[PDB]
Amino acid sequence: TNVRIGAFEIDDAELHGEHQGERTLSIPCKSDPDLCMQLDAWDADTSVPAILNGEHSVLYRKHYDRQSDAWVMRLA
Amino acid sequence: SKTNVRIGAFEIDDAELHGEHQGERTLSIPCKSDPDLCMQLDAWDADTSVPAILNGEHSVLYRKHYDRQSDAWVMRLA
């Protein structure tokens, strides 16, 4: 829930459990539109560094969820 | 590159209008070049149309897919 990406600190990311051999989290673009815009323009094939509840982690862009207007990111 | 599009408060000249292909026509909006428009596309009301002026003609678009390879919002022409 405590997520930092670059200069952005958000507390409304949704960290999902481990499903299908993968862990993901969703960033709500209606709440965090500046971060989502940066994710849109992010270099392809490049990781997104993140601090997850204090733990430095690596995220990858997985899918833009049109139904919920959220960036779905893959952990690790 | 050769397509003018007006959506909301934005007017771009670098969208790419693809030909009809597998029964639909799509338009790519490059978010590395038009990031403020892409921000408004991100938060658009889901399953609502996106009115647009496309090469000077009124048109209806729908969000299709965010293309991670090309960093572009791919839209479907109604």
Closest residue by Cα to residue B3 from B24, B36, B22, B30: B30
Domain containing A52 equals 3-75
Domain count of chain A? 1
Closest residue by Cα to residue B42 from A46, A55, A64: A64
Give the count of beta carbons closer than 10 Å to the beta carbon of residue A3: 23
Distance CA A60, CA B17 (A): 28
Partner-chain contact B46 A67, CB within 8 Å: yes
Neighboring chain B residues of A48 at a CB cutoff of 8 Å: none
Q: Is residue B61 within 8 Å of residue B74, measured between CB atoms?
A: no
Distance CA B47, CA B19 (A): 23
Hunting for tokens 């293309």 — which residue is that? Answer: B67
Task: Tell which of B42, B50, B69 to mutate to test the A interface (max A CBs under 10 Å).
Answer: B42
Q: Residues of B numbered 6-25 whose beta carbons fall under 8 angstroms of chain A's beta carbons: which are they? A: none
Partner-chain contact A41 B63, CB within 8 Å: no
Distance CA B5, CA B13 (A): 6
Hunting for tokens 């996106």 — which residue is that? Answer: B50
A61 shares contact with chain B (CB less than 8 Å): yes
Secondary structure (DSSP) of A13-62: -EEEEEETTEEEEEEETTT-HHHHHHHHHSPTT--EEEEETTEEEEEEEE
Question: B43 to each of A16, B29, B36, B38, how far by Cα in Å?
Answer: 21, 15, 11, 9
